[PDB]
From a paper:
The Very Low-Density Lipoprotein Receptor (VLDLR) is an entry receptor for the prototypic alphavirus Semliki Forest Virus (SFV). The mature alphavirus virion is approximately 70 nanometers in diameter and has T = 4 icosahedral symmetry.
To elucidate the precise mechanism of SFV-VLDLR recognition, the single LA repeats (LA2-Fc, LA3-Fc, or LA5-Fc) in complex with the native SFV virion and SFV virion alone were firstly reconstructed by cryo-EM. To increase the resolution, a block-based reconstruction algorithm was applied, which improved the resolutions of SFV virion, SFV-LA3-Fc, and SFV-LA5-Fc to 3.02 Å, 3.45 Å, and 3.55 Å, respectively. In the structure of LA3-SFV, LA3 binds to the DIII domain of each E1 protein at both the 5’ and 2’ symmetry axis regions. It is worth noting that LA5 was also observed to bind to E1-DIII at the 5’ and 2’ symmetry axis regions in the structure of LA5-SFV. However, the sites in LA5 that correspond to LA3’s Q126 and R114 are occupied by S204 and G194, whose side chains are too short to form hydrogen bonds with K347 and E292 of E1, resulting in a weaker binding affinity compared to LA3. Similar to the results with LA3, single mutations (E197A, P207A, W210A, D213A, D215A, and D217A) in LA5 led to a complete loss of SFV binding capacity, while S204A, as an exception, had no impact on the binding of LA5 to SFV due to its inability to form a salt bridge with E1’s K347. LA5 can also independently bind to site-1 to -3 and site-1’ to -3’, but when LA5 binds to site-2 (or 2’), it creates steric hindrance with the LA5 binding at site-1 (or 1’) and site-3 (or 3’). Therefore, in the presence of an excess of LA5, LA5 tends to bind at site-1 (or 1’) and site-3 (or 3’) to avoid steric clashes and maximize occupancy at available binding sites.
Author numbering:
A (entry chain H), C (entry chain A): 1 to 438
B (entry chain B): 319 to 422
The structure:
């Protein structure tokens, strides 16, 4: 028996579905979203880590000269100085007074610990959803892991469930993403090969294991002091440490809809938005023949107390007359009130009680017990507590019933005004007809 | 078929071979007007006919409008002489031909 | 000196760019696309391969009875039969004449060679383009590899190059793809957990090494024939073997724009569509001072022969007067004609020759040698060879110049008709003015 329904994507909300086969007694399902997960698709751009400056020992050529030689090294800088007269601890070598030469050399290379502390640069697109739904009905109670897209069917006790695609296509990750340890940032990083010194991406590598490297830190050499051997240099500090201190904010403490951002892999969990359609296919053994189920007649609904709070703050009672005792499946056909239980045990005493939660001052909903039916209405008082630590258990609908007190007052006033207008219209029509007949 | 875009075929285990067409025809350009039409009909034989028909129709419309305007101008200029028992002024008769050749 | 241009995405096209700095002699670059690669992003769905039926030996329990036991095996089937009287070569055992039972067992399992011969089901979206471009200017050769998107800068001899995103967003891959060895199929495969027997995907596995398996091949047992021990069964043949015989066509022989599909990784190569914007940044060392470049005056252009063929079927002659001999940059400012050379040897003799290819009956363009300008017009006859094995070297522009023979005839006829109409208007206006002045 094929069926379809739409259920909200709110964690912990006890959704109940009603199935009414013409030949069998009605059945009530309970589906609950225990946990979700939003998986984006990532493309690695490059890897940035702190650099380390390699400076070899100078080569002081006594009584001669040397020539610079170009090399293929990241940010290689080499210069040659003349007229140097170095010293050492025991004396001064390079006997030649002024015909000496020093060759200075320096370049940049990736640090030793880059494979432990590095920040990635990704591009994120086409998020994919994943869920974990608990399904219970009759004597069946299981939890399954389902991809939320209409191409994965899971079997629970002989029943086939297909969870349709999410209603909306909203994702919290921008087109560009920077990931560091367990934090995600919505940042726009410089393109590869065009990084600027002193900021994020001063040195870039295509992958942590990649051999090539692009470095730009404006490493510049200076002439050594007289009578010294030290190879002076100046360099703009690493951009990674500037970024590590001035990254600013995050996505863990900034994501909308109250969903946590986690890493390895990058995902956003328990993030309430949209609706998840559900398609079903039930066997004929789940239902019960209507001859076996009890027959319920003369159903009347009365409400004891009502209070539109977050928890189940309503007490509701049914009176009936039955021939045999058994089990029915209760359900509310309007989302103004949400029942707590999906099965009430019917006895010949003819009195059962139910709990419900509502969020409107005066609700009106129709409830069914087995095949019976009845209309419920009540007056509810506000709650006193200002703040509670649990989520709302109702559908959050506020507009009251047309038979409520406020709308009854409005109806009476409008009826009086309409009667006055009708009387005036009738008087005018009679007068003008009399005038026309003359 | 081998259009101007080109195509390839794969025969047996051999590598695919590509062939491209070339802008060739049977007309003769830079000649009489009745040969340029053939040359540009060898290439794209659906727009040349439409362009020729459109140009010919526009020329016919223009020449018909001009001839009608000459006729209307002559009729407007000559009709005052018909409302009086006057002459034809043979100076105007020579330039503007009218229905009365010599009789009035 | 920043510059920008757009180049066609046609492999082998000799694109030439002209840079005109106002303090230096003009420069001409050559860029050629050697190889491209359209790379889609893939998500694995499931893996299908030929199945194998496992049928254990029967357990003939006799002078007693046996009960079937359920197991968690894919497509498991078990039954117990009563009244068997088996026979063997030496005789018949199980003394009990009719009080014997046989238990049949069978199930499905993944084949032995599934990890060398299997078909993959993918989801493809958001293709990424990659290219390899050859650039030459002055004396600098070299080819580079570039990601075709606005976020990769490559330096070639001191010049920074950024290749912008492709103009079009067309991909030959549909949403769903089935990959087999080196063939790609645009196919709509059934969802996981809902495979039908006898067709593609009768058995599915989430990954080649995954333990889980969903098999639906309608395995059904039958009662053994009297006096034998054989465990009969019937089963729908494998769906993978069927798919191998009637998959139909492929994408290698079906893709548009004449681009070959390859596998591992899935990509589409040399696939001509759209335009590639180019952003450039050149240093001052590439240009030449205007004082060093020779001065060219009195530039005239003449054409010897012209045949609008695919290859360079045009010869052009330039006459000039110079003071010294050197090198100029030769460029054509209209796409109706494409020059073969980018630089020419200028000499005091005053004659140089060039080669160009056109696709129009009467081309007209302006050509520059260093700083001089000249206008060329030609009459071209059609070629005689019907089919050639090489691509066209022109821009495929057919409309002739306004000074061509056909357009000249059109101009003459239109002028005659306009003169006639103007005379008509003048005569009518004169007559109307004479009539009004009366
Ligand atoms: C021992 O000490 C003596 C000090 O005189 C060293 O003699 C020096 O040898 C170098 C060898 O290159 C000479 O340099 C050359 O000088 C000429 C002329 O100035 C120049 O054209 C060359 O390009 C090169 O620079 C240097 O002039 C010379 N000193 C003098 C002549 O006063 C000697 O080399 C030392 N022995 C060693 C280091 O084994
Ligand atoms: C349907 O099956 C699920 C399990 O598949 C049942 O979940 C059960 O939920 C209750 C309360 O939510 C769990 O009891 C809790 O145990 C912890 C243990 O530390 C205790 O601290 C709590 O105070 C509470 O008593 C119970 O463990 C859990 N069953 C499991 C995990 O197997 C669910 O109750 C079933 N449906 C019905 C209607 O019973
Ligand atoms: C050696 O051969 C004799 C042949 O008589 C086997 O005796 C058979 O034993 C089985 C096992 O108990 C008997 O089956 C029983 O049948 C009664 C109904 O008569 C039923 O109520 C029991 O639940 C059980 O199924 C069988 O009747 C009996 N044969 C005869 C003729 O009575 C004996 O088991 C063999 N020895 C061994 C070690 O197998
Ligand atoms: C920039 O470098 C490329 C690659 O080195 C140069 O292209 C190469 O040009 C030479 C001729 O100058 C080609 O050699 C000849 O190729 C033909 C092809 O049929 C062959 O039959 C001859 O025996 C001879 O080997 C060479 O193949 C060609 N390379 C490629 C990959 O096509 C290019 O000329 C250089 N740029 C400039 C401005 O020279």
């Amino acid at each position: 028996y094929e069926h379809s329904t739409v259920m909200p994507n709110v964690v912990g909300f006890p959704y109940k579905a009603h199935i009414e086969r013409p030949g069998y007694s009605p059945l009530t399902l309970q589906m609950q979203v225990v946990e979700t997960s939003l998986e984006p698709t990532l493309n690695l751009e490059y890897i940035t880590c702190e650099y380390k400056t390699v400076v070899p020992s100078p080569y002081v050529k006594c009584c001669g000269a040397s020539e610079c030689s170009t090399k293929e090294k990241p940010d290689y800088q080499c210069k040659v100085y003349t007229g140097v007269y170095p010293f050492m601890w025991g004396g001064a070598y390079c006997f030649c007074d002024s015909e000496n030469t020093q060759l200075s050399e320096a370049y940049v290379d990736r640090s030793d610990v880059c494979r432990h502390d590095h920040a990635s640069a990704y591009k994120a697109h086409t998020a994919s959803l994943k869920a974990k739904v608990r399904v219970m009905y009759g004597n069946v109670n299981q939890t399954v892991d389902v991809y939320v897209n209409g191409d994965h069917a899971v079997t629970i006790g002989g029943t086939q469930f297909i969870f349709g695609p999410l209603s909306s296509a909203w994702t919290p990750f921008d087109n560009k993403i920077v990931v560091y340890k367990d934090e995600v940032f919505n940042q726009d990083f410089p393109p590869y090969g065009s990084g600027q010194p002193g900021r994020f991406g001063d040195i870039q590598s295509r992958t942590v294991e990649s051999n090539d490297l692009y470095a730009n830190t404006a490493l510049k050499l200076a002439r050594p002091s007289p009578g010294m051997v030290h190879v002076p240099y100046t360099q703009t500090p690493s951009g990674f440490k500037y970024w590590l201190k001035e990254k600013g904010t995050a996505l863990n403490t900034k994501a909308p809809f109250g969903c946590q951002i986690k890493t390895n892999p990058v995902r956003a969990m328990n993030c309430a938005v949209g609706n998840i359609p559900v398609s079903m296919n039930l066997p004929d053994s789940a239902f019960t023949r209507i001859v076996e189920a009890p027959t319920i007649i003369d159903l009347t609904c009365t409400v004891a107390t009502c209070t539109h709070s977050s928890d189940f703050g309503g007490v509701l009672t049914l009176t009936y007359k039955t021939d045999k005792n058994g089990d029915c499946s209760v359900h509310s056909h309007s989302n103004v009130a949400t029942l707590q239980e999906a099965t009430a045990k019917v006895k010949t005493a003819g009195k059962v009680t139910l709990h419900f939660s509502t969020a409107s001052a005066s609700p009106s909903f129709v409830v069914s017990l087995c095949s019976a039916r009845a209309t419920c209405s009540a007056s509810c008082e506000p709650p006193k507590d200002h703040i509670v630590p649990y989520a709302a258990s109702h559908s959050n609908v506020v507009f009251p019933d047309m038979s409520g007190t406020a709308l009854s007052w409005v109806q009476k006033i409008s009826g009086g005004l309409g009667a006055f207008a009708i009387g005036a219209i009738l008087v005018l029509v009679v007068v003008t007809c009399i005038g026309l007949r003359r | 078929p081998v259009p101007v875009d080109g195509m390839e075929y794969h025969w047996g285990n051999n590598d695919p071979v590509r062939l491209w067409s070339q802008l060739t025809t049977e007309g003769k350009p830079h000649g009489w007007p009745h040969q340029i039409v053939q040359y540009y009909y060898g290439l794209y034989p659906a727009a040349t006919v439409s362009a020729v028909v459109g140009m010919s129709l526009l020329a016919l419309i223009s020449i018909f409008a001009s001839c009608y305007m000459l006729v209307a101008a002559r009729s407007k200029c000559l009709t005052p002489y018909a409302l009086t028992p006057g002459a034809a002024v043979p100076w105007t008769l020579g330039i503007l031909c009218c229905a009365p050749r010599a009789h009035a």
